[PDB]
Write a protein that binds this ligand. Structure first.
Ligand SMILES: C[C@H](O)c1cnn(C2CCCC2)c1
Length: 119
């Protein structure tokens, strides 16, 4: 029932994501010199360094907010992909599966702790 435990759990999960080779295209903001029309398709760019910085700055109130930003990394990749003949979207799908598998208990424990706090 520790209401703050999610933060270190998210830091550790981000460390695992950064070691994973599948995170390579998503570790830093998309380079507009490489993808000049990126902002014509994507309204809100997101990447794992921005998520980590937001977490470390104390600018996430809950793991649900962090989840929403990580999911935006994957939705942006899906929206920008021209087709399955894209290694980057395929990497996003595997990385998304890995993230969802690990974030499930973080969200459940946090929501349970908050329900206990407000009992
Ligand atoms: C074409 C490819 O599927 C794709 C999707 N999004 N992107 C961005 C995010 C990662 C670096 C560039 C490339």
């Amino acid at each position: 029932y520790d209401i703050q435990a999610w933060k270190k759990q998210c830091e550790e999960l981000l460390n695992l994501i950064f070691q994973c080779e599948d995170s390579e295209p998503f570790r830093q903001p998309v380079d507009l010199l490489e993808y000049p029309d990126y902002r014509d398709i994507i309204d809100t760019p997101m990447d794992f360094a921005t998520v980590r910085e937001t977490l470390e700055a104390g600018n996430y109130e809950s793991p649900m907010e962090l989840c929403k930003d990580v999911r935006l990394i994957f939705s942006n990749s899906k929206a920008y992909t021209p087709s399955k003949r894209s290694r980057i979207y395929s990497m996003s799908l595997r990385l998304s599966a890995f993230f969802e598998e690990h974030i499930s208990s973080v969200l459940s424990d946090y929501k349970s702790a908050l329900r206990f706090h407000k009992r």
